Amino acid sequence: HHWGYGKHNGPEHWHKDFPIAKGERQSPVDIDTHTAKYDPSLKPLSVSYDQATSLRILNNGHAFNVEFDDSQDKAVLKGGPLDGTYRLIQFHFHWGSLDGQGSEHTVDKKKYAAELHLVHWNTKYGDFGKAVQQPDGLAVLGIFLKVGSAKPGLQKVVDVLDSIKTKGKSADFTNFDPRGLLPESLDYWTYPGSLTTPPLLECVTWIVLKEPISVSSEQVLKFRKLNFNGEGEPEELMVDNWRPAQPLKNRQIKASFK
Numbered sequence: 001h002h003w004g005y006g007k008h009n010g011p012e013h014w015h016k017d018f019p020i021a022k023g024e025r026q027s028p029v030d031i032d033t034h035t036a037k038y039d040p041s042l043k044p045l046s047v048s049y050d051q052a053t054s055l056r057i058l059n060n061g062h063a064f065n066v067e068f069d070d071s072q073d074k075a076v077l078k079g080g081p082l083d084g085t086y087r088l089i090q091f092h093f094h095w096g097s098l099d100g101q102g103s104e105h106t107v108d109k110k111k112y113a114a115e116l117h118l119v120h121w122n123t124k125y126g127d128f129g130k131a132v133q134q135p136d137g138l139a140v141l142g143i144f145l146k147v148g149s150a151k152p153g154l155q156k157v158v159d160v161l162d163s164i165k166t167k168g169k170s171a172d173f174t175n176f177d178p179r180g181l182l183p184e185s186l187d188y189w190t191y192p193g194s195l196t197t198p199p200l201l202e203c204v205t206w207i208v209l210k211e212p213i214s215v216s217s218e219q220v221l222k223f224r225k226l227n228f229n230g231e232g233e234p235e236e237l238m239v240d241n242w243r244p245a246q247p248l249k250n251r252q253i254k255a256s257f258k
């Protein structure tokens with residue numbers, strides 16, 4: 001067996017193999033907008049994706065990852081709440097079986113249809129595997145998806161999904177520009193948290209954008225045609241691959257905006 005999002009191995013079971021699941025800085029969380037405090041000391045986010053080099057897309061059995069060449073300082077996240085330079089390694093999404101659920105973070109208990117995670121590692125730790133062992137090792141930029149108008153910059157991702165239907169399939173995926181997945185505004189909330197999948201390491205500075213992007217119903221329907229299973233195994237649609245909100249405990253969520 002293995003962890004997953006099924007009836008028998010979903011989020012409420014993860015603690016049995018990953019006891020940090022019940023830890024002090026777990027993610028995602030509900031963002032209570034009225035209690036989040038505006039912090040005028042927070043800087044604008046600096047997103048520098050002009051030279052980003054995508055390489056490949058992978059169905060890993062839990063989601064799909066669009067992977068980047070992180071061997072040089074290209075595609076970096078700086079500023080905001082962060083000290084230093086964080087390099088983009090991959091992005092992926094979490095989504096629902098229906099448009100009314102799918103996000104990991106919630107906003108005043110509102111669930112979005114999906115949530116995009118742009119994952120970055122702190123260059124002071126040299127590579128990703130070392131960074132996840134540090135409390136300031138990662139910065140994950142989270143972006144909500146709502147269903148409405150299509151996101152033109154998402155379509156190249158949607159169209160390659162047919163070629164990675166099942167667990168363990170990958171496809172070449174070069175020249176994809178992740179700037180096409182951003183909203184207009186970079187206003188954000190931030191808090192200290194964790195990976196949202198096992199091993200659930202408490203190594204993430206979360207930066208969650210206030211403004212969702214709009215994707216079309218047809219775009220998200222194509223996410224829901226993916227499979228958790230491998231080729232030749234009983235079909236299990238890749239849907240509801242989100243962890244619910246976890247206790248905030250002794251944390252403060254800060255807002256970059258009034």
Ligand SMILES: NS(=O)(=O)c1ccc(Cc2ccc([N+](=O)[O-])cc2)cc1
Pocket residue numbers: 001002003004006008009010013014015016017018
């Ligand atoms: N703690 S965990 O890594 O999430 C984990 C959870 C459950 C199990 C056992 C398991 C039992 C049944 C199924 N199942 O029917 O698909 C899948 C897994 C094994 C491991």
Ligand SMILES: NS(=O)(=O)c1ccc(Cc2ccc([N+](=O)[O-])cc2)cc1
Pocket residue numbers: 117119132140194195196197198199201
């Ligand atoms: N969903 S999320 O919090 O943005 C997230 C981002 C990246 C990862 C990837 C990952 C991170 C760490 C390990 N690990 O230490 O074995 C394995 C995979 C896992 C989860």
Ligand SMILES: [Zn+2]
Pocket residue numbers: 092093094117196
């Ligand atoms: Zn994620």
